[PDB]
């Protein structure tokens, strides 16, 4: 029922479980990229390059 106390109100619980083994990380989260400011002596790193 939608008339519960906070202790028993329906809570959506998602257990995001991360896993490592002798395999490459087929799932990553590298969603942090700079922009492309060009033609200056700078530090570039093209995805590990």
């Amino acid at each position, epitope marked *: *029922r939608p*008339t*519960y*106390g*906070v*202790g*028993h109100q329906p809570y959506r619980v998602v257990v995001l479980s991360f896993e490592l083994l002798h395999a490459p990380a087929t799932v990553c989260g590298p969603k942090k990229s700079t922009n492309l400011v060009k033609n200056k002596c700078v530090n570039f790193n093209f995805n590990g390059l």
Partner: antibody
Amino acid sequence: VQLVESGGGLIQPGGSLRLSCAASGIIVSRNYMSWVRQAPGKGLEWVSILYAGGSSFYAEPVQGRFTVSRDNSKNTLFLEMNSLRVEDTAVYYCARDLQWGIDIWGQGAMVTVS
Amino acid sequence: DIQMTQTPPSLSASVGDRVSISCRASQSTGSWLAWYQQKPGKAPKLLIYKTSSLESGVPSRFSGSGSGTEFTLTISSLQPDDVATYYCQHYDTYSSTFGQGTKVEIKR
């Protein structure tokens, strides 16, 4: 938390009762509550449990007869005994059930069916 | 069904003495047994649950142990707060089964 029960008295066989028990110090819609009767000269018998979600779980003998409920606004557990039997006489206690079990015991209401 | 038996039904011991009481189930319950203390005219107080966990508030002198079929409560030293009846309850989400009760009194 104090559980204060009322309605303890005499009732004819086959009659209807509504035992009450106010819970003080906690919100009834946030904890498990239970009805447990102790007959004179016997151990305890947990007869029913109402969850904080309104999910009523009755024992098979009391399934279809007794109605466990809670008034969150009044914060009071109620038990609607229906189709009473001779064996339904006992000191009936409202109680608070938890992960660990029954921690808060009501003072109890006597119930005599004869 | 599942029936638990308590021994001794008639025990007279003195304050300071141990009170060794035994409650045995006919078959294995694993760990779903609890020790309670009830006085006449009073409701039982849960002394120990899971047969090894000290219930919060009950004196540590009570040492409940056991599994499966057999269980034993040991009052290390009797005290006047321990002069009462003792029950063992098989734990179940439904009605379950309770012990017959070991009434402990002051020996004289």
